[PDB]
A paper describes a structure:
Mutations in the ACE2 receptor binding site on the surface S protein have been shown to disrupt antibody binding and prevent viral neutralization. The protective mechanisms for the coronavirus disease 2019 (COVID-19) vaccines are still being deduced, however, several analyses have found that the elicitation of neutralizing antibodies (nAbs) correlates with protection (Feng et al., 2021; McMahan et al., 2021), a finding consistent with many other successful antiviral vaccines. nAbs have been identified that target several distinct epitopes on the S trimer, but the majority of nAbs target the receptor binding domain (RBD) (Barnes et al., 2020; Piccoli et al., 2020).
The global resolution of the two complexes was 3.6 Å (CC6.30/HPM7) and 3.3 Å (CC6.33/HPM7) and model building was assisted by local refinement maps of just the RBD and fragment antigen binding (Fab) variable region. In contrast to CC6.30, this nAb binds the RBD-down conformation and the most stable reconstruction has 2 down RBDs bound by the antibody, while the third RBD is in the up position. Indeed, the binding of CC6.33 to a down RBD requires slight opening of the apex to relieve a clash with the RBD ridge of the adjacent protomer and is likely the driving force for the unoccupied RBD shifting to the up position after the binding of two Fabs. Although modeling suggests that CC6.33 should be able to bind an up RBD, we did not observe this in our dataset, possibly because of the HPM7 spike design preferentially displaying 3 down-RBDs. Also, portions of HC framework regions 1 (HFR1) and HFR3 contact the RBD ridge of the neighboring protomer (still in the down position) in a manner that mimics the interaction between the unoccupied up-RBD and an adjacent RBD-down ridge, further stabilizing the interaction between antibody and spike. The parental CC6.33 and eCC6.33.8 were effective at neutralizing all variants tested with similar IC50s to the original Wuhan-1 SARS-CoV-2, consistent with the observation that CC6.33 recognizes the conserved class 3 epitope (Barnes et al., 2020; Pinto et al., 2020) distal from the mutations in these viruses. The binding affinity of CC6.33 Fab for S protein is approximately 10-fold higher than for RBD, suggesting that the CC6.33 epitope is poorly formed on monomeric RBD and/or differential processing of the N343 glycan affects mAb binding.
Numbering used by the authors:
A (entry chain H): 1 to 52, 52A, 53 to 82, 82A, 82B, 82C, 83 to 100, 100A, ...
B (entry chain B), H (entry chain C): 986 to 1034
C (entry chain C): 848 to 887
D (entry chain L): 1 to 27, 27A, 28 to 106
E (entry chain C): 14 to 66, 79 to 143, 153 to 175, 185 to 247, 254 to 259, 262 to 296
F (entry chain A): 297 to 444, 450 to 620, 640 to 676, 689 to 690
G (entry chain C): 740 to 788
């Protein structure tokens, strides 16, 4: 039922920000939680942070405490993550993932490559 | 239990209505006898004394 | 306050037509009448 | 935080053999929040096991697992060539996520 | 860990008058300038209360316990509540050990004399512990201090109401009226049939086995009319089953 | 016309008639809830890989979270969704304490026993639901998960109390034989397994059952629905929703000494008098808007159609020719510096009449 | 208001009954009228002041 | 709605009965007072005047 749809790949210059868009298909944007996970080339996954769109609450990984702002648009069922002050160190695939309350499954988007 | 509660409540309502009816009649009748007693008291005072 | 509690549940009290002052005036008139002219 | 460590970091096995991957938590975790994933280069992680059991929809059914406390295992009953992959366990604590160690499986 | 010592002064139980103590605020509702009819477990007025004084026997919990203690010595630190207290079932240990107030519910095996010493040279209490359902830890810290408590256990919720007042006590509890405000409601889910207090043995420990007292009563499902003053404080009460008056 | 309708007449006699009321309306609604940061952990309840046998049914406490019940209700995966004491639609906007989710596996023919007042081997020996019950019984077919294990109590000395979980498995006397253990003849083991197989008929297919038990409107709330709060507007007629409590009235600051553990106040009628606001712990009083009460002073209709209206208990500051009297505000009458014989009585020394340009 | 405390649903259910409220209002109105009459009969016997 | 209607009707029946009881007693008390007032009026007419 649940589908996560992400925006395409981008190329950035140092110091710029990247805003990744994740649309929640299948509904239940509210009463669910959305997190963002990064995968630098050659690395495993790491948590960046997330948001609960219904409760208007954000939460961040210590590694990413600051620089990144996570928001959610209830009207368009879309979550966003904007990571500022980019460096070549941030080349990674940025993934959107979510879980509904009442469920156990974690649904994933495609992952978008952002280079700097 | 719940089957009995329905039947028990029906009897309670019917019996309460009976008591209320009884009391109302006694109150009305009591007013009547009081009026008689007041007359009797008047006669005692005026014709005996 | 109890009168308010009663009011809030639809229970109210209407004023009397005659006030205490009006009653006092009737009483005084009767007394004046009796003292001045007896039962006439 | 609670750190998950898997073992062996790398391993070479033959198709047709049984294989297991361990996942140890530095602190006890609820089994209900643990999951295993499979990854191939260029692909998004695929869910296999959740709630430390509960095979995922569409799974090959060669995969199963169990655990409690600090010790959990992913079992592949027979390896097929398609099962040689990076595998990892993660904890979905919902306020805390834990990732790391791919116990990379090769032929 | 645990001390297999007897060597106690052999005393009978003493008894006292509960007077008019034992009212609890039964609700979270503000009422004022009213007299309200409440049926709950309350200490009966003028009940026969058992007086204890290093006296720490296992007592029945029954339907709830009215507990009061008097000291200046800081000996009474807490309570142990449960059934068998031998790791077969869970039990509740509430202790003020100065370092923290520690409340635990676990399948604990306890010492037959689960005490604390005094500084604090030792803490004994336990022999073992299984996986524990509940834990809470608070932050670190003629008789003069009276503390009144009631311990209720309703549908798994251990409910404690309490009050702390100044005294000048040489024997029994003072006569007067009090009502206890709720302190805590613990969502535990356990069976309590027996309990002991937790005392801190003075130490300068048989070689130094060294001044506090407490009272135990029981609650009954009586109806009281509780008088609320203009500030919503219960100031008085009528025990509707004490006598014809 | 109001007088004509109450009297069922097209003609009205001289005098005073009592009609209608004075019902001041709310202009906006207010919603106030505690700010809860968690979503409720129900994946563990409904989507669990293992359920208990009924015999040793599980009980999970839910607290300090937001729960959207729209999802469970709208989901088509359930074979049954029966609520007692609450409409599933309304459930979503209520706030609770002590919410518990009981769970277990049953045979399909046992679905009818998970109910407040039903009897049978489950209802009497494995899981008794109270006759007095508020909550929802939700269940679905699990044949594809559980069938290939589970034991049920068939032989018990006595019936269970509501929400009792008695799991002793000791073998005991049923009949005449003075034994325990020694299974056989007239001593029996209390439980029987009912393994689930893909070949079982539907009455013997397993079902996963979750029972949601709630304590509604306990003064606190820990489990609360997905409802946003609004600003708190004072000194106006509003609708209200204080942690699930509703009503209409004018709310004001209250100088009441609520104790630290108190959060509602009550009237003699046991209606809400006051609340403690869920976000700012301020005490607020709730006072109903206005009652008025209106009577109409009418010259007979065979003379004229002018009327005067008396608002029985109002100030002439609220509602040309307005007279404030002890009996209320009289509107439309012309007060004069005179006196006369009483005609239509009003009250408190005042009467009225129709007289001259009348 | 006594019965249906500003509930539309209650009012509509109340209307399934007969003219109950009307009779209660008539009874209480009648009493109130008598109370003023009683006062006048007892005190206003002489209209000369 | 339909469940509320059942519960509301239970409360309406009870409240109707409460008001009806009140009025009946209020009428009886009013009758007693009229008798007292009539007596008072008689005394004034015969002993004061
Ligand atoms: C956890 O929840 C998911 C989502 O409702 C369940 O997945 C569905 O299972 C049925 C039965 O096999 C399939 O027909 C659906 O297509 C699945 N939906 C999705 C989105 O995958 C899953 O079975 C639940 N797990 C447990 C243990 O209850
Ligand atoms: C000695 O202590 C142990 C541990 O509490 C207890 O089980 C045992 O019964 C005690 N024995 C005596 C004689 O006090
Ligand atoms: C509590 O313990 C007593 C004594 O063993 C037992 O009879 C009773 O059933 C127990 N109650 C509960 C809820 O376990
Ligand atoms: C969050 O809750 C606290 C405590 O009740 C309150 O003081 C604060 O204003 C709330 N914040 C909101 C509603 O943003
Ligand atoms: C308003 O009501 C008060 C009593 O609360 C009264 O004293 C005052 O005269 C009234 N006022 C008007 C019509 O201004
Ligand atoms: C009526 O009385 C008021 C109050 O004393 C006074 O102001 C007004 O002038 C009077 N009117 C007449 C016509 O006497």
């Amino acid at each position: 039922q649940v589908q996560l749809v992400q925006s395409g790949a981008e190329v950035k210059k140092p110091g710029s920000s990247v805003k990744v868009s994740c649309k929640a298909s299948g509904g239940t944007f509210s009463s669910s939680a959305i997190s963002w996970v990064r995968q630098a080339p050659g690395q495993g996954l790491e948590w960046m942070g997330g948001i609960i769109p219904i409760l208007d609450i954000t939460n961040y990984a210590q590694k990413f405490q600051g620089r990144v702002t996570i928001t959610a648009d209830k009207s368009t069922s879309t979550a966003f993550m904007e990571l500022s002050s980019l460096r070549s160190e941030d080349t990674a695939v940025y993934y959107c993932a979510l879980r509904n309350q009442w469920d156990l499954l974690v649904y994933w988007g495609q992952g978008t490559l952002v280079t700097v | 239990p719940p089957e009995a509660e329905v039947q028990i409540d029906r009897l309670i309502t019917g019996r309460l209505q009976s008591l209320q009816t009884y009391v109302t009649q006694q109150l009305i009748r009591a007013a009547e006898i009081r009026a008689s007693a007041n007359l009797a008291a008047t006669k005692m005072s005026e014709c005996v004394l | 306050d109890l009168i308010c509690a009663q009011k809030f549940n639809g229970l109210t009290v209407l004023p009397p037509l005659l006030t205490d002052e009006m009653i006092a005036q009737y009483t005084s008139a009767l007394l004046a009448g009796t003292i001045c002219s007896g039962w006439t | 935080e609670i750190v998950l460590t898997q073992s062996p970091g790398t391993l070479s096995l033959s198709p047709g053999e049984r294989a297991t991957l361990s996942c140890r938590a530095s602190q006890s975790v609820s089994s209900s929040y643990l999951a295993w994933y499979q990854q191939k280069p260029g692909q998004a992680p695929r869910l296999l096991i959740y709630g430390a059991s509960s095979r995922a929809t569409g799974i090959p059914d060669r995969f199963s697992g169990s655990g409690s406390g600090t010790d959990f295992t992913l079992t592949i009953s027979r390896l097929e060539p398609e099962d040689f992959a990076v595998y990892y366990c993660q904890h979905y604590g919902s306020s805390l996520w834990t990732f790391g160690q791919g116990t990379k499986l090769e032929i | 860990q645990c001390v297999n010592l007897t060597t106690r002064t052999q005393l009978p139980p003493a008894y006292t008058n509960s007077f008019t103590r034992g009212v609890y605020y039964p609700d979270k509702v503000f009422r004022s300038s009213v007299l309200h009819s409440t049926q709950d477990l309350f200490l009966p007025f003028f009940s026969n209360v058992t007086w204890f004084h290093f006296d720490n026997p296992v007592l029945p919990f029954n339907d709830g316990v009215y507990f009061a203690s008097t000291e200046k010595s800081n000996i009474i630190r807490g309570w142990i509540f449960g059934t068998t207290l031998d790791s077969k079932t869970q039990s509740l240990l509430i202790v003020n050990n100065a370092t923290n107030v520690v409340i635990k519910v676990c399948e604990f095996q306890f010492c037959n004399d689960p005490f604390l010493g005094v500084m604090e040279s030792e803490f004994r209490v336990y022999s073992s512990a299984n996986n524990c359902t509940f834990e809470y830890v608070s932050q670190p810290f003629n008789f003069k201090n009276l503390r009144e408590f009631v311990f209720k256990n309703i549908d798994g919720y251990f409910k404690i109401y309490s009050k702390h007042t100044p005294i000048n006590l040489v024997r029994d509890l003072p006569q007067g009226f009090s009502a206890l405000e709720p302190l805590v409601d613990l969502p535990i889910g356990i069976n309590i049939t027996r309990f002991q207090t937790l005392l801190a043995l003075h130490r300068s420990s048989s070689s130094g086995w060294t001044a506090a007292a407490y009272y135990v009563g029981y609650l009954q499902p009586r109806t009281f009319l509780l008088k609320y003053n203009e500030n919503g404080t219960i100031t008085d009460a009528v025990d509707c089953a004490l006598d014809p008056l | 016309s109001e007088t004509k309708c109450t009297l069922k007449s097209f003609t009205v006699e001289k005098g005073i008639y009592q009609t209608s009321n004075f019902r001041v309306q709310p202009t906006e609604s207010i919603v106030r809830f505690p700010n809860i940061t968690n979503l409720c952990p129900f994946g563990e309840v409904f989507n669990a890989t293992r359920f208990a046998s009924v015999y040793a049914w599980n009980r999970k406490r839910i607290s300090n979270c937001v729960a959207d019940y729209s999802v469970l209700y709208n989901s088509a995966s359930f074979s049954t969704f029966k609520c007692y004491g609450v409409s599933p639609t309304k459930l979503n906007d209520l706030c609770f304490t002590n919410v518990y989710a009981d769970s277990f596996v049953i045979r399909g023919d046992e679905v009818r026993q998970i109910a407040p007042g039903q009897t049978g081997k489950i209802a009497d020996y494995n899981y008794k639901l109270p006759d007095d019950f508020t909550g929802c019984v939700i269940a679905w077919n699990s044949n594809n998960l559980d069938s290939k294990n589970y034991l049920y109590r068939l032989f018990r000395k006595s019936n269970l109390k509501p929400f009792e979980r008695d799991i002793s498995t000791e073998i005991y006397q049923a009949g005449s034989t003075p034994c325990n253990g020694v299974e056989g003849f007239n001593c029996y083991f209390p439980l029987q397994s009912y393994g689930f197989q893909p070949t079982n008929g539907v009455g013997y297919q397993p079902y996963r059952v979750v029972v949601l038990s709630f304590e509604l409107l306990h003064a606190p709330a820990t489990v609360c629905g997905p409802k946003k709060s609004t600003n708190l507007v004072k000194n106006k007629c509003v609708n209200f929703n204080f942690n699930g409590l509703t009503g209409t009235g004018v709310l004001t600051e209250s100088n009441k000494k609520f104790l630290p553990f108190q959060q509602f106040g009550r009237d003699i009628a046991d209606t809400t008098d006051a609340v403690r606001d869920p976000q700012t712990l301020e005490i607020l009083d709730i006072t109903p808007c206005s009652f008025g009460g209106v009577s109409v002073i009418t010259p007979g209709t065979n003379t004229s159609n002018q009327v005067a209206v008396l608002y029985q208990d109002v100030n002439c500051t609220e509602v040309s020719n307005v007279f404030q009297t002890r009996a209320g505000c009289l509107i439309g009458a012309e007060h004069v510096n005179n006196s006369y014989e009483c005609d239509i009585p009003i009250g408190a020394g005042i009467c009225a009449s129709y007289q001259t340009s009348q | 208001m006594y019965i249906c405390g500003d509930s539309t649903e209650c009012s509509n259910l109340l209307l399934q009954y007969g003219s109950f409220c009307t009779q209660l209002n008539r009874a209480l109105t009648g009493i109130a009228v008598e109370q003023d009459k009683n006062t006048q009969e007892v005190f206003a016997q002489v209209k000369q002041i």
